[PDB]
């Protein structure tokens, strides 16, 4: 057996620096969902492993030219990483490349604006040209508005496509705090998982509205044929009908509350 | 090529039998949404296929003493169908025997009432005796709770193992039909769908009640290996990614709402 090299991204609450950890060493340096996933993940299929925050700070995108993948999604393809415990979204173009498991927590696309923001929905955000909004630059939530056919949200994508400054974001921090800072001028599209996070946190200023615009999941990636993908794919079935999964859930978004 | 046998099992709103259409021959008997499902799998993965009811009307279950499968699982680990197209909830036990694709919808158990029974929760229903409450007699909710080491699910099972007249069910229909009867003294424990749909059926007298127990998923099931399993899992994503599955959910759902 050898150490099993773990790619995740620095994502509140799956992986999170400890405070004042910066100079020590190991996987004792972080915490969160992810992190807490990774222990049982590993210990249910009977590996040791090392936590590593992917180099790009990307998830995983294919380059329309080079043809290369970015993110975790090439760190597992190019053999960099032998599995990705981050919320890595269950895609058909990443299926294609890479292994996932089961979903092991369910998600859709939603909107976070700053309190008080006149706006319920995507149809909403789509009539008007007041308030300006986007997504996580690389992602799956730009290529849903990249490939919809569905009116509104092919609507939604011309504008975001092509807007000026730009309303595409490098990080979700940097989505939220855009957000925050915009005066209600701007409205951040994001996965509902992290959306109902930030709105328990303070300064408590955002909400989510809305239902969400889609349905998927994340899943655990490992690279096409790995060895671990059968065992992996087990073990999350596993810690979602021993309820460690609720029991994660509880513990990062709502035991965390500060609102 | 040769023809795909689908096992499939009688339950609204996912295969129903089209009125007066008993007597006819072939897949046009049947309407619901594992039939538009069945229909559209079958395009995108190029099969031809013939959909047949499951012969003993049951999900799937290991016999404890025998160690044989019955229900749609069966079909599938002895051979007599190709896939199983159905709400069949994706398990630790089952996925060790049968393949699964990605989920095509989300559910978890949830509590029907007869509209006015004083009950709330699963805590509710644990904390007294007067109202009975049970599940489907061979399915994955039996399993959850005959498994649960959560205080109020394992209160409940002991409850439920021993109650008398049995308050396990053969049939959806059957535990519907039995709360409707029984003047708000028995509740039925199943999946969020079910309960969501019939809630919408008249004579609109019942209701769901609470949040769900658990979250989980259906999946399109192959036999161990099959050469149909990467193709189908594949078109659930491409389904998902293309809003198909949203449109049938609000097709046979919300559209077909009575009440
Ligand atoms: O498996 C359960 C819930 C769950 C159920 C289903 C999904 N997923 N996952 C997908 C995905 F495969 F990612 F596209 C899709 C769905 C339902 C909607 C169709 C596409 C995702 C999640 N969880 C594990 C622990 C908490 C949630
Ligand atoms: N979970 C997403 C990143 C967040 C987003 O695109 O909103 C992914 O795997 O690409
Ligand atoms: N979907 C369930 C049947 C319904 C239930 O158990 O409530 C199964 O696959 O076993
Ligand atoms: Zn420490
Ligand atoms: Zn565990
Ligand atoms: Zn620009
Ligand atoms: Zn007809
Ligand atoms: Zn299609
Ligand atoms: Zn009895």
């Not at 509104?152 to 855009?178: C, I, L, N, Q």
């Not at 915009?182 to 809305?210: F, H, W």
């Not at 596993?238 to 965390?256: C, I, M, P, R, V």
């Amino acid at each position: 057996n050898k150490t099993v090299v773990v790619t995740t991204i620095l994502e509140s609450p799956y992986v999170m620096m400890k405070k004042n950890h910066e100079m020590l060493e190991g996987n004792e340096r972080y915490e969160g969902y992810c992190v807490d996933l990774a222990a049982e993940i590993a210990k249910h299929c009977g590996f040791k492993y090392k936590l590593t925050i992917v180099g790009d700070g990307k998830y995983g995108a294919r380059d329309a030219d080079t043809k290369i993948w970015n993110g975790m999604v090439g760190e597992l393809v190019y053999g960099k990483a032998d599995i990705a415990i981050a919320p890595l979204t269950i895609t058909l173009v990443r299926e294609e490349v890479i292994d996932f498991s089961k979903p092991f927590m369910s998600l859709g696309i939603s909107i976070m604006i700053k309190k008080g923001t006149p706006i319920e929905s995507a149809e909403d955000l789509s009539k008007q040209t007041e308030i300006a909004y986007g997504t996580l630059d690389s992602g799956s939530t730009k290529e849903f508005f990249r490939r919809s056919k569905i009116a509104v949200f092919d609507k939604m994508w011309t504008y975001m496509r092509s807007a000026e400054p730009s309303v595409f974001v490098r990080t979700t921090a940097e989505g939220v705090a855009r957000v925050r800072k915009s005066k209600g001028k701007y409205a951040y599209l994001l996965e509902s998982t992290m959306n109902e996070y930030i709105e328990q946190r303070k300064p408590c200023d955002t909400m989510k509205v809305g239902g969400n615009l889609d349905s998927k999941g994340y899943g655990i990636a490992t690279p096409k044929g790995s060895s671990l993908g059968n065992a992996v794919n087990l073990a999350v079935l596993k810690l979602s009908e021993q309820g460690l999964l609720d029991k994660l859930k509880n513990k990062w978004w709502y035991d965390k509350g500060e609102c």
